[PDB]
Design a protein around this nucleic acid. Structure first.
Length: 225
RNA sequence: AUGGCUGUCGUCAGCUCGUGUUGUGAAAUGUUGGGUUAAGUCCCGCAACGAGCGCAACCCUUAUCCUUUGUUGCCAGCGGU
């Protein structure tokens, strides 16, 4: 449902970027500057985080398909487990340019993953030679590394969850073109114009992103009840 | 005025298209870049995702061996010459 302010300092969600890379549009969401490092205003994010979680909850109550987005090293594996914990979908390694705006052409690539999976469990690769069986399994390995989170998708997402918004500005722009509401974790270096429901928080720490991922995988499941 | 056929750049590795995105727009992207190759041949990354003509392969011949077949072909092991 909601979390307090005491655990905010434990995860370091106020530990933003320096006074060199900050975005000018972070003035309503910066508490101050400690040793030339901007501190995220923790009194401003806690009313804005819970209204997004209730915004993420009722869309999940109407059988909403939530998509998770994050392609950074610190949160590449944490975003995969959080989506499956709440029975949702994820994008973890690489966001393909045109994954949502060009949804038609990537579906042939999605079924191009499915026929390789049906050729994996039944025992089909073993009849072919060494060269053919190696590359089509190597083409397989690249496939669910970038499309395995959305191989169960079958449509356009109802809502979008974004980590490292400035690093994933392509994903936010793609959902904005189709009118899909996004849920981005904006840090001091990021731009929140594309973000419909702004959540100011630190995104460069493993323990910080798991606090959001743990909370967003928690808020979905009672909407499933 | 043409069909059909042919040479040439050049058997040079390029030529494009669909969707999406960018730019008012001509168009750009993909096709660029780090490696790599005879080759946009392959890997990775990347607002690109895929596909087609090209490359290669599939075709013929040559390079070694096995099986079957032995004439008008062949002559190792046995005879007459």
């Amino acid at each position: 449902a909601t979390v307090s302010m005491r655990d905010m300092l434990k995860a370091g969600v106020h530990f933003g970027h320096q006074t060199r890379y900050w975005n000018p549009k972070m003035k309503p969401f910066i508490f101050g500057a400690r040793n030339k490092v901007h501190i995220i205003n923790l009194e401003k994010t806690v009313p804005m985080f819970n209204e997004a979680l209730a915004e993420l909850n009722k869309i999940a109550s109407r059988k909403g398909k939530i998509l998770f987005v994050g392609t950074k090293r610190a949160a590449s594996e944490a975003v995969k487990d959080a989506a499956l914990s709440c029975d949702q979908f994820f994008v973890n390694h690489r966001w393909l340019g045109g994954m949502l705006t060009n949804w038609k052409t990537v579906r042939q690539s999605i079924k191009r993953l499915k026929d390789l999976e049906t050729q994996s469990q039944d025992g089909t690769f073993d009849k072919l030679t060494k060269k053919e069986a190696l590359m089509r399994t190597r083409e397989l390995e690249k496939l669910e590394n970038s499309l395995g989170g959305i191989k169960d998708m079958g449509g356009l997402p109802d809502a979008l969850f974004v980590i490292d918004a400035d690093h994933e500005h392509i994903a936010i722009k793609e959902a904005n073109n189709l009118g899909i509401p996004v849920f981005a974790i904006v840090d001091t270096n990021s731009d929140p114009d594309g973000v419909d429901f702004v959540i100011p928080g630190n995104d460069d720490a493993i323990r910080a992103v798991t606090l959001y991922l743990g909370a967003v995988a928690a808020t979905v499941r009672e909407g499933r009840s």
